[model samples]
Target: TCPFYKKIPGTGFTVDAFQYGVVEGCTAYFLTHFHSDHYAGLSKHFTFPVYCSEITGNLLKNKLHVQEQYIHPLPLDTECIVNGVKVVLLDANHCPGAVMILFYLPNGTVILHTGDFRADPSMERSLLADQKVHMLYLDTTYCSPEYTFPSQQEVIRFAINTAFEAVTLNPHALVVCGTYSIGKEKVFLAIADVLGSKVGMSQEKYKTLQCLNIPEINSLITTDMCSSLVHLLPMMQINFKGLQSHLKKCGGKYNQILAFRPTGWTHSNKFTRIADVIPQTKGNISIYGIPYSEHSSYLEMKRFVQWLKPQKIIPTVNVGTWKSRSTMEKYFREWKLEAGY
Candidate 1:
């Protein structure tokens, strides 16, 4: 039954089985966020009654396309119960599809599962409020010494600023970036602010903007129409090579450009000049690396841990733990090093 998690040494049951099967004393199961690591085990096997927020429910529906037979979808800020267990959904801004869960028990033991929740001050104020909850299971993705990131706003600012400078310096060169349609649209609006939006995008690009409500970014654009700066990047070699060639040929009159390579990932080495691409006349096409990545950095990781204040923090996904982890208990000891992200 354990397709992913390990089974107990003596007993055949895994964590998935334990969660699915009703423990003699337990009441209900609360799924906090929509991610593989947290939710993957519950994919097909666990059919016991489940509870989560509307955002998580919508995201799961979009991904799994499952019916509401076994899994019960709960509403936002509403107190709900599954199999007699009480739960309240809270905001977890680590990703668009995430939530912090607060569980209330009849035995006076309040439980809180801080699934992948991080503090994002820019997030919805309504989602964040004063709440007193009990036991917390938090994400330890950053408890290592190497993790670091610019503030969320600063990260977005740098990305937009870089893309903006690239477009202004070279009119003919088109920019290629990677992200969801919702986020990419913001980049277009940012660029359109500097350049006239009417001249910046085609009619088709304008249509995409109507699908999303981006008042903060949209108001900044020079024109009422949507900008074409947010282009959907395609896969490398297998699909986008031809498109790349077409852009290079068409953009010759515009001067060398600054844009994301639709597909290709290489670390910035000492010898390699970041954001500097040398176009090859013969074999390899020119592409460059931008010093940007989206995730919790070392500083952000520290902030997250400080916010959670878990009893004994356990790290995940690194060279430290879960490699030769014989048991879940061992998983914690292997990860208890005095290091952090």
Candidate 2:
């Protein structure tokens, strides 16, 4: 549980419990997304009903073994009144099925929970229009101006174009794309469609994507690395040892190997767009880290805050320690603060 887990001053409901605040007589539990960090302590033994988006609920049931009965599916833009609290859900655009929770308390106060979202135009019109926000619980992952990156759509195009370049430049090379278990399916799908090839990944990734049921990803998936021109591997496997191991096991099927890491950490103190490409690798392997982030950057956050103009801003992460707390407070005071790829 984070600092924002505390009950609203005038309401008895609790929000987003991982381990600590999940146990007793609270009104209900809200799960924003299915990222392990956000759903850490949740399990099959969870007693109370968990309110979340449909895909998240399905994942919880299928992946984590949470009983289906305990999950209450919360769809986007729908309001549900539970125990006197009006709860509304909105698409977060962070990952598939991620949602931002809006709580309209009986005391006339509105609280926003931006659960790991990319604050694009849809979010502004859906959550910030004609609504007075009392408090905003933010995701401060990129809270500093140093984290300027392009839109996910631009980054997607950059990544696809880079794949084309890597393969075109090195005819005998196999392009490997790295991504999380759930978040970056769009990149893999787009690449697959563009290259007219099937994507390679762990069975777990395929299963998760299958459950997601996105229309564009209705193609074949396999773990046979040699069967496809471009392969989609786990994000952690893009490094030196991992790539080296995979290469050795492949037995020289590929003359050269190119790795692409599409993520937010591509640039720290500057902005990077579609044409910008940074290659960070050692020795033989060619690796590129592209700035494809789902969370809002500092400049985006600045605009978000100026638009919403909440009475107070409360951070959703690192509410435990004074050192982290001070950092978050300073970042919020600095005024602060994407649609597709």
Candidate 3:
């Protein structure tokens, strides 16, 4: 009964399928976010009319140079008719430009495609709460019970306190934050605010931030490498070898280095405390892998599924193998029964 994963079951809409080139039956192309995995094969020469949030549209234009005419930036919470199907955009809470797409078919079917999201209580107040969703394309990134982690607020607080303690122990300890191109800004931004320090990043990243158009973040950004003790680097550069090279690059201005590699993959039930998950140390370098994730936790996914109780669910992230998909389906069956559907 499984349909083509990329194409919506009954509509001409194809989602995040750029890598496949033009899907034969699809007419409208919808992009959930600007992440590389989602927008893999999108290029300047691509000619389809792309629908997404305004922020996502700006990112596609700025980062990938995707032409403006091909981009359709839709407003959140408002419904508009796109090729005869009603469409709405809702905040995904995953990244700067991420959104969950809602579609209403003429046949009276309601569909939701959660690109990637951190489920929040506030989501219950949206228009989706009233609709009986027929099909839900879910982001099953952390579908197993073993993947349960603390909330974003708890992890953010832990990251800030960790930074504070590191600096208090050694005032000259340089605090480096590991981040992706767009996600995990809250973790680093909160740390910078609490410490009253500037954030240093590459010129390219700075330009990308500018495209986000958040006025408050502008003052905290800096291109000057030597000015800020707290610096942002790509996630791959948070290792001991990378830190050693970075320390040398700074001409030994700082006495020690304390870096944070934040992601949900770091969380494990074996650890009593989230902060204790990773406390790797090598000579003068310390690295902490905190469970600060943009995706919903396993419990959160259960909560969302129970609340929505869609007629059918399609796992988006870990569906490549039958074993993995079956494991996710076990949880879905339990959630469906709990929802009394």
The runs of at least 3 residues in candidate 3 whose Cα sits more than 4 Å from the true structure, single-residue gaps closed, are 1-3, 275-278
Question: For this target, which candidate reaches the highest TM-score against the unseen true structure?
Answer: 3
Better of 2 and 3 by lDDT: 3
Q: Model 2, which residues run further than 4 Å from truth?
A: 1-6, 169-172, 250-253, 266-284, 330-341
| TM-scores for every predicted model | 0.58, 0.87, 0.94
lDDT of 3 by residue, 116-205 (tens): 898887898898898799999999998987777777888888888988988888888898989777888888788988888888889989
| Deviation in Å, model 3, residue 108 alpha carbon | 1.2
Cα shift from native, residue 24, model 2 (Å)? 3.7
lDDT (Cα, tens digit) per residue for candidate 2, span 127-176: 45867998988887777667777777887787788778777787767778
Q: Least accurate stretch of 10 residues (summed lDDT) in model 3?
A: 266-275
Q: How many backbone clashes does candidate 1 have?
A: 11
lDDT of 3 at 41: 88
Predict model 2's lDDT versus the native.
Answer: 0.76
lDDT of 3 at 39: 91
RMSD of each: 7.8, 4.1, 2.1
Top-scoring candidate (lDDT): 3
